[PDB]
Amino acid sequence: CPEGTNAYRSYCYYFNEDRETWVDADLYCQNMNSGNLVSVLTQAEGAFVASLIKESGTDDFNVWIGLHDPKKNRRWHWSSGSLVSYKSWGIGAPSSVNPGYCVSLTSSTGFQKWKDVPCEDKFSFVCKFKN
């Protein structure tokens, strides 16, 4: 994987401290590497991604991942199109009361759990791409 990015099981990943909307972040991932916002497909991959973010030294609270609810009916999809083989919702997520339609990793959980937030929030983000 290229400098600045880290390999994990066939893919390359990187944390970008640029705060963007969920949409723009995902586009960034597509443009720079023909990747997407990270899909977290196993517990082990979530552990890897959490450690990647922590190693950066960031003090951010929320980091985008590629999960969103495109029809606002709480049917979640990865932007990369992967199946949802793994879920790691934090306490009280996803909210049915104040639903957000995009998903972030939360520093309060070591970036191991997810929270649904407004897609128009500007958070840092992790990209995942092949090669």
From Swiss-Prot:
Specify the superkingdom.
Answer: Eukaryota
Q: In which tissues is it expressed?
A: In pancreatic acinar cells and, in lower levels, in brain. Enhanced expression of PSP-related transcripts and intraneuronal accumulation of PSP-like proteins is found in brain from Alzheimer disease and Down syndrome patients.
Which GO terms fall under biological process for this protein? antimicrobial humoral immune response mediated by antimicrobial peptide; positive regulation of cell population proliferation; response to peptide hormone
Query: Which UniProt keywords are present, listed alphabetically?
Result: Disulfide bond, Glycoprotein, Lectin, Pyrrolidone carboxylic acid, Secreted, Signal
Positions of the C-type lectin domain? 1-129
Keyword match Glycoprotein: yes
Post-translational modification here is noted as: In the crystallographic structure, the attached sugar appears to be N-acetylglucosamine, typical of an intracellular protein, rather than N-acetylgalactosamine.
* One GO MF term: growth factor activity
Quote a single Gene Ontology cellular component term: extracellular exosome
Localization of this protein: Secreted
Cystine pairings recorded for this chain: C1-C12, C29-C127, C102-C119
The job of this chain, per UniProt, is described as: Might act as an inhibitor of spontaneous calcium carbonate precipitation. May be associated with neuronal sprouting in brain, and with brain and pancreas regeneration.
Name by which UniProt lists this protein: Lithostathine-1-alpha
